[PDB]
Amino acid sequence: MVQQLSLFGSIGDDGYDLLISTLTTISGNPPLLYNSLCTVWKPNPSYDVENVNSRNQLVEPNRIKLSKEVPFSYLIDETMMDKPLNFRILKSFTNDKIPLNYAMTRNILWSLQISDIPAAGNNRSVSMQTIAETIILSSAGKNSSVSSLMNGLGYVFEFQYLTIGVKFFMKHGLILELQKIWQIEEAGNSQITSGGFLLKAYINVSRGTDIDRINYTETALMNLKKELQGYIELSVPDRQSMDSRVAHGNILI
């Protein structure tokens, strides 16, 4: 469980290369390639959860995220082994098509994660969100599989998507991510972040009670934002967009 303090933004791919150089001028570090695959699961509507205390609202149903890393050998087509595995490959990832299709992901079926809507009030300068996390290491039995496990808990699959981007590690534990997101269905693959990169700068705090640390984290994030003034505008997203409860449906992408 962490308090994640975050700021968001977006950029057009035209400046992409330039942006990268500037980051290396500041951090002093080179970018590192990465990828991931997230699957979202929701409580089964076939089961009537009368246990939701309607007269008191002790709790509301929520959605579970399962993440995993996928090797690049599934994301590189027959035209791309010649180039080395570095960040420049992202320049060729502008098409809505991608080597990883629905059948391979179905064949695949980790990190389990749950979150809450950010803190209310208009006196917050950065998006503060609470995250509860655990890890699944292995399994066994006659039906050892992620799908069977989540159906045993009482959850069913809803959708999935694939993230590819680069990471920058700066001082004080600040992490800056440049991402491209591909939604995947049997109908096909569609790039929601079409013609651009999604930028997200964030820090993690282990204990929410410590307030000196939280103040330091906010100071670092606002200093970073004030450093990038004039190039990219980093902003607090909409509090109602980062809500992932089942009752109301929307997805920040």
């Binding site: 400046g15 330039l18 290396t24 001028t25 002093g28």
Partner: protein, 108 residues
């Protein structure tokens, strides 16, 4: 050494201030000639037109070229890093020295 683009940029700038110096010098000669023109000898009268014309054409195109340079500044935007490899190159040379130490036939 610097990349060539900066080299011709600095050459153009140097040409700019040399042209400015030439403009100042020509101002000096035109001020000189106007004195004797006021004195009353008409022999150097034809030279006056040439001096004035060259002075004005030196004043104009210099500013024009400087304007071009400042314009180049407009579109040139968007177009310790060495440390990231610095240790590496140091590493390389050290091993090279070891090679020179390792072979006694090359120490001459």
């Amino acid at each position: 050494m610097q990349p060539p683009y900066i080299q011709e940029r600095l050459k153009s700038l140097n040409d700019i201030e040399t042209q400015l110096c030439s403009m100042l010098q020509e101002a000096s000669q035109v001020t000189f000639i106007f004195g004797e023109l006021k004195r009353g000898n008409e022999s150097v009268k034809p030279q006056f037109e040439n001096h004035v014309k060259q002075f004005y054409e030196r004043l104009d195109k210099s500013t024009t070229q400087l304007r071009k340079e400042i314009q180049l500044l407009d579109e040139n935007v968007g177009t310790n890093k060495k440390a990231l490899g610095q240790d590496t190159e140091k590493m390389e040379e050290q091993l090279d020295l070891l090679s020179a130490i390792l072979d006694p036939s090359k120490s001459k």
